[PDB]
Amino acid sequence: QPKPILYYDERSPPVRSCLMLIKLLDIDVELRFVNLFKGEQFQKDFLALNPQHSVPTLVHGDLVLTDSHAILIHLAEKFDEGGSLWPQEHAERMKVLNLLLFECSFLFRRDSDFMSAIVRQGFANVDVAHHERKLTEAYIIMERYLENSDFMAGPQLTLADLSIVTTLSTVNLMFPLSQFPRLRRWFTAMQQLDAYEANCSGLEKLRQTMESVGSFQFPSSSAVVT
Amino acid sequence: QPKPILYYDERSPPVRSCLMLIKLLDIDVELRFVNLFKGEQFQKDFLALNPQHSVPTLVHGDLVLTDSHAILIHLAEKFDEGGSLWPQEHAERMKVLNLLLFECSFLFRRDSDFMSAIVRQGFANVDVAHHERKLTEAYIIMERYLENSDFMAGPQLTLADLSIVTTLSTVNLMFPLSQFPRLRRWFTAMQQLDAYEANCSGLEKLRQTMESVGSFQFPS
Ligand SMILES: Cc1ccc(C(C)(C)C)cc1S(=O)(=O)Nc1ccccc1C(=O)O
Ligand SMILES: Cc1ccc(C(C)(C)C)cc1S(=O)(=O)Nc1ccccc1C(=O)O
Ligand SMILES: Cc1ccc(C(C)(C)C)cc1S(=O)(=O)Nc1ccccc1C(=O)O
Ligand SMILES: N[C@@H](CCC(=O)N[C@@H](CS)C(=O)NCC(=O)O)C(=O)O
Ligand SMILES: N[C@@H](CCC(=O)N[C@@H](CS)C(=O)NCC(=O)O)C(=O)O
């Protein structure tokens, strides 16, 4: 019954969500670095493990998970059994699942589109206003989700907050949260959590890498700093 | 308990996955059509319900689900407790979940990218070779997933097959499966399912609407 193995590159927001859960729950996990900027995700053995050539990838015994949201759910069920991060009551759990899928299908997709365009085209050649519209629309949606509750999926911290805060912090490197009071209040609260320390290093490394590869600077005024 | 309400436009592959499960499980639902090509997902009451302005959206009592994969899991858990579609064993369930997320993050994302490019740019201006690459890569991955099993997540049909097949068939409007023996056999087998009837109307409607909006004709 070996301990979980996490193939990771901390610059990835989804990776940082798993790192946050691992810290929060004090899970002993072996970390194996896969440098996405060097193309190590295309190494023959890693491609054999995960044809999607993506991180995070978790190997836990015979189970191989290739999506951060399955990893969060699996680790919560194995190490937060009966807990509130992945709540027990069906309706509450479905709400968390719904927000995890929002992060996958909407927030991360749009941030990935924007950041991938910077890498492929160079910042100066990206239609920044187009991506500002796409990502501001995500801000609007999250502000709507927090108008009803202090956390994304209810009155208390869940996997949904861990998944969303890492990508939110990455989007906020570029786009300010000035017009989004509930989102700012939530993001500030998330930054006070001990587990949020697992987000800081990879976010800074991503900032450095993006500014280098994209030949630009994020506006220092955008990022919320607590 | 009030019956579930499904807001839908059957051109949507993820909508069609939910329609297939509803047929598979004989679920009594109220369907409410939201015409995506008239922008009805932006009607004030629907945005109020789903800020993502997306279908499928399920309202089941007080629970509002805004993603097909949550809808599939929810409906399987209410209406198919003890079935093989959403297996009870943890390892098997995680495998199904992992494949559902592949459909969302990889297969559907790339098909959505391609279809979106048609609408934004016009078919005649789409870099078809680029999207043929991204999507053939998805075919390659699914062919590998099928190495050991008859179905995407194992020896039996699961929610993962329902989610993947609808998007597959949409990709297959443009890109054939002749070079993927496992994938083609799997798709043919899926097409024999009684529940696959739920995919037929929306797939044909999507082709027809895409061809007017794209001002082209799919090679199929
Ligand atoms: C952003 C990005 C672009 C391109 C790459 C390659 C080197 C693989 C081409 C890697 C990354 S990344 O390592 O920084 N990861 C992400 C981080 C934030 C948002 C999206 C992504 C993403 O990969 O889609
Ligand atoms: C409420 C409940 C009761 C019993 C079960 C078992 C069949 C495991 C006994 C599972 C659940 S559940 O609603 O809490 N389950 C998930 C939802 C989404 C994604 C994964 C799961 C999961 O069960 O792993
Ligand atoms: C019916 C319709 C109307 C309007 C839209 C826009 C949002 C593009 C204006 C999309 C659709 S659609 O339901 O046909 N859309 C997809 C179909 C197949 C694969 C992916 C998609 C997708 O929307 O990403
Ligand atoms: N939905 C997936 C997204 C995984 C993903 O796209 N990871 C990126 C980094 S953020 C990656 O590994 N890219 C490597 C590649 O695509 O080649 C998840 O939540 O894990
Ligand atoms: N991951 C989501 C994707 C939902 C989605 O993107 N639906 C499309 C149709 S395929 C839609 O409703 N588009 C309308 C819009 O975004 O305005 C799911 O599986 O439900």
UniProtKB/Swiss-Prot annotation, chain B:
It catalyses: RX + glutathione = an S-substituted glutathione + a halide anion + H(+). GO terms for biological process: cholesterol homeostasis; ecdysteroid biosynthetic process; glutathione metabolic process; response to toxic substance. CDD domains: GST_C_Delta_Epsilon, GST_N_Delta_Epsilon. GO terms for cellular component: cytoplasm. It comes from the Eukaryota. Residues 2-83 form the GST N-terminal domain. Conjugation of reduced glutathione to a wide number of exogenous and endogenous hydrophobic electrophiles. Essential for ecdysteroid biosynthesis. May be involved in detoxification. PANTHER family: GLUTATHIONE S TRANSFERASE D10, ISOFORM A-RELATED (PTHR43969), GLUTATHIONE S-TRANSFERASE E14 (PTHR43969:SF5). Member of the Halloween gene group. This is Glutathione S-transferase E14. It comes from Drosophila melanogaster (Fruit fly). The gene is GstE14.
